[PDB]
Paper text:
[name]+ T-cells provide broadly cross-reactive immunity and alleviate disease severity by recognizing conserved epitopes. Here we identify 9 highly conserved IBV [name]+ T-cell epitopes restricted to [name]*07:02, [name]*08:01 and [name]*35:01. [name]-restriction was further validated using peptide pHLA-I tetramer staining for 7 IBV epitopes that elicited the strongest IFN-γ+TNF+ [name]+ T cell responses and displayed >99% conservation among IBVs circulating in the human population between 1940 and 2023. This included 2 [name]*07:02 (B7/NP30, B7/NS1196), 3 [name]*08:01 (B8/NP30, B8/NP92, B8/NP479) and 2 [name]*35:01 (B35/HA231, B35/NS1260) tetramers.
Residue numbers in the entry:
A (entry chain B): 0 to 99
B (entry chain F): 1 to 9
C (entry chain A): 1 to 276
Write the structure that this text describes.
Amino acid sequence: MIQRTPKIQVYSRHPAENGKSNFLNCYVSGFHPSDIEVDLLKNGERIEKVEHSDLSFSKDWSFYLLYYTEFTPTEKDEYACRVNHVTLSQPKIVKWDRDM
Amino acid sequence: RPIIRPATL
Amino acid sequence: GSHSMRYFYTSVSRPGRGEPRFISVGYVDDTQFVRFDSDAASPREEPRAPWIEQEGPEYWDRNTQIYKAQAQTDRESLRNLRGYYNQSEAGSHTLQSMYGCDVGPDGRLLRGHDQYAYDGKDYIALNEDLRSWTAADTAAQITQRKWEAAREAEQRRAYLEGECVEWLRRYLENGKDKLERADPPKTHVTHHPISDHEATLRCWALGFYPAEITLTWQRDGEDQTQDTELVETRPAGDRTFQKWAAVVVPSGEEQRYTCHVQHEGLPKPLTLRWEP
């Protein structure tokens, strides 16, 4: 049974602008099996209002999901995505990199 | 719209 | 131009815990339009695009019954595969299925698809002739023999050559504005000093539909495969996509580097430079 580890991208729906509403996206792809848990974080605390896409998969049968939440980025707030998968011995945390 | 596939693997 | 319809089924067994989870999504090109989840409080096929909401109640009710029956069929398939592989009933397993049709600009079927994976590996696939099968291993050969004895490919072909193409054409007509559109990328190049001797150029494509795109860095007209960092094309969440490609270049040579963008919605391929 092949297991594939999730690839993780953390990014905003639009170019981030301080004090302008926006959406924070966490896109996880290329994993298998489909069981997975994803959380979005603000300053280390878990964000509770989080939407996610319906489970689909790619031509190589690996799965992908988009999790996201609305947010208003500011100069001194940090945000991350936290991912649990059977292929990870511990939650994987990827911080949002604001600068393009 | 979806196919109806009662065939089993 | 050319378009496709795809259904993607995922079933995962939960032995000891009864029935498998069954999930379906359907796409036209890169636009999801329906979904079904057997684990929902009240499982129904649900619309995911505005141009599909026009379908009458008979559309949703019957598609819903179709998914529920399919989940029961996939349960037996799962049980069977466990035997083929003499796998204990303890662990959970995944049956995936992907089928649909590609249409060219004139409307004719260009290609039919109907394939299956087990635990994330190719299992059995209908051939491009829609009259034969490719099995991946000796277990898949059991299925192949059953299905070729029962003329299964003829039923698949019938759907792929009629209903699939016909409903695709209808969805394209109901959602012409949205689906026939090609939204070109919004593009720019950013530049980040790394050190006194290196710099990162990042070429951005934002807000494009459909997802297919090519982003290429060139130096004096040569692709930079070894030195290019690419990210997987990603959804923005508003039915558009994003990608970027980055290269590390010697500081003071940034002008030798050009980013080339090919996308269906562009009049002609863009060539982008960094401008200080």
